[model samples]
Target: MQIFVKTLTGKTITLEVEPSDTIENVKAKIQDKEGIPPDQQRLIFAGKQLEDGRTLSDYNIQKESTLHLVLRLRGG
Candidate 1:
């Protein structure tokens, strides 16, 4: 299925993923796309913060979903 990542702003990125995809891996993909670390990327679905340990199925996520990507950045 098509997964759309609606990032911190108007920037959006698309990818394909399944329920078997863990949140950690999910964020890792975002890391590659946005140059952010998985530990710092905050993924949200329907306004609920996603935990890195669980698979999409554990959160009842399905096909054709839009993901909200919030970044937790550190100032240098």
Candidate 2:
């Protein structure tokens, strides 16, 4: 399946993925493609936060899953 890795903004990154991959495995996958830290990122899907140690197979990740990345800061 293909993953649409999107930033909070309008930009997006596409990755070739396997449904068997765990959230943690692909969690940092974006770090290799972008300049963001995994700690500063939050992956969301299906109106819920994706917890680590979970796999796409269990999450019911659609074939064309769009994983939203909310890159945020604690303090302004």
Candidate 3:
């Protein structure tokens, strides 16, 4: 399945992963594609956290769905 991932920098990237892939794996792929570290990753869907061990289907994500991988602000 293919999902669209939007970065905190406003860049949109598309990834093709299997249905069995965990959310954590997609997170890492997003990090690699966007050059963002895991510590800086903050994935939110419907105002809820998308943590590790959760599958894409767990969030009711569908093919061609757009997932936002935002980066939480720290410091000032």
The per-model lDDT (C-alpha) reads 0.83, 0.81, 0.80
lDDT of 3 by residue, 20-70 (tens): 778889888887777777677778776787877988888888888877887
Residue-pair clash count for candidate 1: 0
Runs off by more than 4 Å, candidate 2:
none
lDDT of model number 1 = 0.83
Model 1 residue 73 lDDT score: 75
| Ranking of models by TM-score | 1, 2, 3
Among residues 3 or more apart in sequence or in different chains, the pairs in candidate 3 whose N, CA or C atoms overlap within 3 Å are: none
Predicted structure with the largest TM-score when compared to the true one: 1
* Model 1: per-residue Cα lDDT at residue 4: 85
Please write out the lDDT profile of model 2 over residues 1-76, one tens digit for every residue. Answer: 7888877876889877798888877767888888777778778887798877898888988667788888768942
Best by lDDT: 1
Task: Give the C-alpha miss distance for residue 14 in model 1, angstroms.
Answer: 0.9
Q: Is candidate 1 or candidate 2 better by lDDT?
A: 1
TM-score of 3: 0.82
Candidate 1, residue 64: Cα displacement in angstroms equals 1.4
What's the TM for model 2?
A: 0.84
Winner on TM-score between 1 and 2 is 1
Better of 1 and 3 by TM-score: 1
